UniProtKB/Swiss-Prot annotation, chains A, B:
Molecular function per GO: heme binding; identical protein binding; metal ion binding; oxygen binding; oxygen carrier activity
UniProt protein name: Globin-1
Subunit structure: Homodimer.
Species: Anadara inaequivalvis (Inequivalve ark)
Gene3D superfamilies registered for this protein in UniProt: Globins
Keyword Kinase: no
Length: 145, 145
């Protein structure tokens, strides 16, 4: 359940989440777009869910893609800020799950973002330790899908 | 049209938005719920759009309501952060408009949030000058609806 998943966010996991976000969240536009372009490059199959965005290969030049990219980063910002209170984290995660469920995005599909996060993290000198911390956070959302 | 509305966001207006947000945005859960509950108190009809939240009368205690309220505040956080780059503000605004358009929320309906904002700002001692600044921000989103 989503409540058991949130419980997996131990003290050190939270610290690693915050330490890496401090760097990653510094450039929401740049890193957000990097996240999305990497998702589409490594998982071409997911592009079909983003028809509304148009030519996703345009990257930063695509206004709609940039809109979603920036907004996605503020969702991660939201999760990080809620790490202190599990009750606030869960209600925020559930709200986000709802919008994805409507788009028929499954937990397995949603988890595909772990690859991109791992890559952007590594580009900034954050290794497996951090990628795993982030996978734990994503898992909380997966538990709600 | 959206770009034209963004043009109303002058140097002084942006300055008031940023200064008032420094306080209002410091307690997203508290001020977010204050906004939603006020909207529902002054415009009871708007509740028809939020059937999914269940018993909104529980206010802060309602997890679904709390979830939407906190998330609402990060949308505003997003807008505030994009004030200095019209191209980014616009793409982010249009993204957020899309979701409301889908729910059949007209520009007139959207403008009802202006009252709650004015009251919330006033509770923190930010008068008409600031309320007016915020009305202009909301007007940018209305331009996209
Ligand atoms: C941890 C990773 C993810 C986060 C935090 C996230 C966050 C977001 C946010 C905040 C939005 C914008 C608001 C909205 O329209 O609901 C959004 C939209 C969307 N997301 Fe995600 N998402 C994630 C992963 C994914 C994945 C892996 C897929 C699909 C394989 C997906 C599919 C969608 C779709 C289809 C949209 C609609 C885009 C549009 O047309 O505007 N998301 N996501
Ligand atoms: C300052 C103005 C407002 C902002 C910044 C805002 C922001 C948001 C955000 C960020 C969400 C969550 C993401 C999503 O699901 O789209 C949302 C959802 C929603 N908004 Fe607003 N909103 C505003 C005004 C309004 C008004 C006045 C109405 C209607 C009278 C409205 C109706 C809705 C509805 C029905 C939802 C879906 C809630 C749910 O079931 O999760 N919004 N809004």
């Amino acid at each position: 359940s989503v409540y058991d998943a949130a419980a997996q966010l131990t003290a050190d996991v939270k610290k690693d989440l915050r330490d890496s976000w401090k760097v990653i969240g510094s450039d929401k536009k740049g890193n957000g777009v990097a996240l999305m372009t990497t998702l589409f490059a490594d998982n071409q199959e997911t592009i079909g869910y983003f028809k509304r965005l148009g030519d996703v290969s345009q990257g930063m030049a695509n206004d709609k893609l940039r809109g979603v990219s920036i907004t996605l980063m503020y969702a991660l910002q939201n999760f990080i800020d809620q790490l202190d209170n599990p009750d606030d984290l869960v209600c925020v995660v559930e709200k986000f799950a709802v919008n994805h469920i409507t788009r028929k995005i499954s937990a397995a599909e949603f988890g595909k973002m772990n690859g991109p996060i791992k890559k952007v993290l590594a580009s900034k000198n954050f290794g497996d330790k951090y990628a795993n911390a982030w996978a734990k956070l994503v898992a909380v959302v997966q538990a709600a899908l």
